[PDB]
Design a protein around this nucleic acid. Structure first.
Length: 906
DNA sequence: CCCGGTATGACAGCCGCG
DNA sequence: GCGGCTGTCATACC
């Protein structure tokens, strides 16, 4: 076993490191690390060190890290570049671990915990920590145990001890339904007072100090609450004891709304799962509370209880504790499915960074470029300050709002990373500039060729073709690595398939499985030794073949995330290799790419269909184009197809046989026109959309930029058994839209695309008739409660007050002086309903906390004074009118067709 | 620097307008 | 009384 690191930190003139040694023991080092930095020198001085520009550099070795840091300030005050890695933690990791890090997760202590705090005051602020911590569930990955800390006596109640017997029983039997998987894994311990509890938790923390600390909201609630609580009761010295190095910093996170404070525990990587999920799930969710996320991933959700949580410990302490245990297990179950922690570790050691820096695409890329440059004796440039200067971004085509019967879409692969390599874009690779014509003229190939010598972007930039760019080289690596690991994953998957044939007829023998590598396909000699092998050994080979497939999967997605990271880094002023001209070179070339191929697809389809001057490309967004296939179908005639699958086959082949070669030679023309280093503009066919054959459906429609619906039969080569609706930007996709209305609008769209006008009309009529019979929760809008106090003037709405906020202030006057009634909290989501003019409430609308019924001492009047008309018009009819206008359909039978004209009268 | 550019929509408030 | 704006706020997605 080769040693790896756990956490690294700099305190004064010392690196403090937690690390696993060659024997597997967790250990700590204090090293008085001697960093190196670099300055420019004359050609006379003989060094092996050069910068990315090739200019010679002399190596300066400092006695400590403070001298290094003071030297950087002195070089700034002189006006000369101070070259090298200024984040000395990264240099230490590079020096101490100059090899491919192979870690062993079972020796990494990964803790996830959750806290409970009874509070009749409202949400207990972590910075003040006014109320007693009355429960802690702390899971440890090494022990595989849930350590549960339980407070029996607090100012808010004296309670019985928790029962594991009851907690395991069925929910109908009065039990908490804690899974038998974790029942034999709970270490329960009750306490007579909070001080005893908090002090035991601290001693527990010292013996089992987390390397990775996770959980839901741990960074913004749990950790701050435990720290501040211990601090307020025992003093700051005791609270620092939560850090292995007894050093803590109070960070102030100032978001563009308010300001909150997080606590930095030196020697611990905090990877909050709420942040970890938002970063790596790539699924946009309405709510990000553990409850919603659990039921989404695990189909079980968080544990239910009766009454307000502020009254739970009193009324049902048995539930309260079991709710705390399950809260921790919910996160562990999610991580068992998604494995974002293992992912985070994988990338942390690949980049050689602090694990919590996986949230930073800047840190990660800074280190990956640093390490590969280090092994070539090359010196990284100094990070220079840059003014935040907004530059052009992605091109988006304004579509003509219409229906579109048949649609076929195509995507460029890894567009921005592809341009970087194609054009060879890097700081040191800038070769000069050319007099730039309008983009229009480069799209139409009317402008003169920018350079015979250098590779070019349509923004005026020129780059060397002979040199290998530092950025281009570094991302080509990542590409090649991903292919390599996805070449091992496909091999490990296919190698397991041959094993599954042997799982039907084996023969027992006392032998261990053969030493073979699953990353590469088996030879004939290994294939000969399959039937003879035993049943015990065959299941061991299947275990290790699948184990190899899991290792390949993790690697191939980690590199995928890096590919998509780079542009972000490159376009960020804080990044070392950032250059504004290089950034606009990427986006502008991309703008040219999509519009040039729009031209080429139009010119090809016109020539083939015989027509001239017809817009086939109906829409385009960044790296994708959408083609109208009507003419292609009408060229064969849709009456010649026997079924839906017949014309989907037709279009699929057409794209591959006719369209894709026309695109490739189209882009090959563009590469030669810009004189680029290599052609890397590749376009895959994604979606084939259209209405079912012999149906009155319209297939798809656009209402504007980023607002469309499509009936998709085939995506990226896989044929769907049943048609699947792709909806983007429309109200069905917005969490502000009421539950029943989100459902109704989707069906309205389904009926439009699959069935036609009359069906939509029959549905609308019925939904209008039955709207008043729907539940008041399902038909209410949801909104975010930001800036409540700002627009509040003595309990009434002020100038420029938003609609939902007005609703909140109406609710507040209705429950003014009522503690049992739910309070609307700044930040949290709210239900909104309109009220008929003349109601006993203040205004025209009421808003109450989301996910809850209204207080019974106000419910009747709300339900009585609801404005259904306004609600149906605002949330349902208006957005539908939106879709139907573009689609050129009617939702109501006799609508005057003169309504679609912007008449005079002016 | 632990994601903001390119987007649309709901609503408030203003301006002309016999 | 209502388009035609501008401004604030809310929420999509790569």
């Amino acid at each position: 076993m080769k040693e790896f690191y756990l956490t690294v930190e700099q305190i004064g003139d010392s690196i403090f490191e937690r690390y696993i040694d060659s024997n597997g023991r967790e250990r700590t080092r204090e090293v008085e690390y001697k960093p190196s930095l670099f300055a420019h020198c004359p050609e006379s001085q003989a060094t092996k060190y050069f910068d990315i520009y090739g200019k010679p550099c002399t190596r300066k070795l400092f006695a400590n890290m403070r001298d290094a840091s003071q030297w950087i300030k002195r070089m700034e005050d002189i006006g000369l570049e101070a070259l090298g890695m200024d984040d000395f933690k990264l240099a230490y990791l590079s020096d101490t671990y100059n090899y491919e890090i192979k870690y062993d997760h079972t020796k990494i202590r990964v803790a996830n915990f959750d806290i409970e705090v009874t509070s009749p005051d409202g949400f207990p602020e972590p910075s003040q920590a006014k109320h007693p911590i009355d429960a802690i569930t702390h899971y440890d990955s090494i022990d595989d145990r849930f350590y549960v800390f339980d407070l029996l006596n607090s100012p808010y109640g004296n309670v019985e001890e928790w029962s594991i017997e009851i907690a395991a029983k069925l929910q109908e039997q009065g039990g908490d339904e804690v899974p038998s998987e974790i029942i034999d894994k709970i270490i329960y311990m009750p306490f007579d007072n909070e001080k005893e509890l908090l002090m035991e938790y601290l001693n527990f923390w010292q013996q089992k100090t987390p390397v990775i600390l996770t959980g839901w909201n741990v960074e913004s609630f749990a950790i701050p609450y435990v720290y501040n609580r211990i601090k307020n009761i025992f003093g700051e010295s005791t609270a620092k004891r939560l850090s292995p190095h007894r050093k803590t910093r109070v960070k102030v996170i100032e978001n563009m709304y308010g300001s909150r404070e997080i606590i930095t525990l030196f020697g611990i990587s905090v990877l909050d799962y709420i942040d970890l999920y938002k970063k790596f799930s790539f699924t946009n969710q309405p709510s990000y509370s553990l409850d919603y996320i659990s039921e989404f991933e695990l189909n079980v959700g968080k544990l239910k209880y009766d009454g307000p949580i502020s009254k739970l410990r009193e009324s049902n302490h048995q539930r309260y504790i079991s709710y705390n245990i399950i809260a921790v297990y919910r996160v562990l179950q999610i991580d068992a499915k998604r494995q974002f922690i293992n992912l985070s570790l994988d990338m942390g050691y690949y980049a050689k960074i602090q694990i919590q820096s996986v949230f930073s695409p800047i840190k990660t890329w800074d280190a990956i470029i640093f390490n590969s440059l280090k092994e070539q004796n090359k010196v990284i440039p100094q990070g220079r300050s840059h003014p935040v200067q907004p530059y052009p971004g992605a091109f988006v085509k304004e579509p003509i709002p219409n229906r579109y019967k048949y649609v076929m879409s195509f995507d460029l692969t890894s567009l921005y990373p592809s341009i970087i390599r194609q054009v060879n874009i890097s700081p040191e690779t800038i070769a000069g500039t050319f007099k730039v014509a309008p983009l229009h003229d480069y799209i139409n190939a009317v402008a003169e060729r920018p350079s015979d010598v250098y590779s070019c972007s349509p923004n005026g930039m020129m780059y060397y073709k002979d040199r290998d760019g530092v950025v281009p080289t570094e991302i080509t690596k990542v590409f090649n690595q991903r292919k390599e690991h996805k070449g091992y994953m496909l091999a490990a998957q296919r190698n397991g398939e041959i094993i599954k044939e042997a799982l039907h007829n084996p023969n027992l023998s006392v032998d261990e499985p053969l030493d073979v590598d699953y990353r590469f396909d088996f030879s004939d000699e290994i294939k000969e030794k399959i039937k003879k092998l035993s049943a015990k050994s065959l299941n061991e080979m299947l275990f290790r073949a699948q184990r190899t497939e899991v290792a390949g999967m993790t690697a191939q997605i980690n590199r995928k995330l890096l590919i998509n990271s780079l542009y972000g880094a490159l376009g960020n002023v804080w990044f070392r290799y950032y250059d504004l001209r290089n950034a606009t070179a990427i986006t502008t070339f991309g703008q040219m790419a999509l519009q040039w191929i729009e031209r080429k697809v139009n010119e090809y389809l016109n020539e083939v269909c015989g027509t001239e001057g017809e817009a086939f490309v109906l829409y385009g967004d960044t790296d994708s184009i959408y083609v109208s296939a009507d003419k292609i179908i009408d060229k064969v005639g849709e009456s010649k197809f026997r079924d839906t699958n017949h014309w989907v086959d037709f279009l699929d082949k057409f794209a591959r046989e006719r369209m894709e070669p026309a695109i490739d030679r189209g882009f090959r023309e563009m590469c030669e026109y810009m004189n680029n280093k290599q052609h890397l503009m590749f376009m895959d066919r994604e979606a084939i959309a259209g209405p079912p054959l012999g149906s009155k459906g319209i297939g798809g429609f656009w209402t504007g930029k980023k607002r469309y619906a499509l009936n998709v039969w085939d995506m990226e080569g896989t044929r769907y058994a049943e048609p699947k609706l792709k909806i983007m930007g429309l109200e069905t996709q917005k969490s502000s839209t009421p539950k029943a209305v989100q459902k109704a609008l989707k069906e309205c769209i389904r009926r439009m695309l699959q069935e036609g006008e009359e069906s939509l009309q029959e549905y609308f009529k019925e939904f209008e008739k039955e709207f008043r019979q729907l539940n008041y929760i399902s038909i209410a809008s949801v909104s975010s409660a930001n800036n409540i106090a700002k627009y509040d003037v003595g309990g009434f709405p002020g100038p420029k007050c938003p609609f939902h906020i007005r609703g909140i202030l109406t609710y507040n006057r209705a429950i003014k002086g009522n503690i049992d009634a739910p309070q609307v909290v700044e930040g949290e989501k709210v239900y909104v309903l309109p009220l008929r003019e003349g109601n006993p409430f203040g205004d025209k609308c009421i808003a109450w906390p989301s996910g809850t019924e209204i207080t019974d001492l106000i419910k009747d009047d709300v339900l009585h004074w609801m404005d259904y008309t306004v609600l149906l018009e605002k949330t349902f009819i208006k957005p539908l009118e939106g879709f139907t206008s573009a689609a050129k359909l009617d939702y109501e039978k006799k609508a005057s067709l003169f309504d679609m004209f912007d008449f005079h009268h002016h």
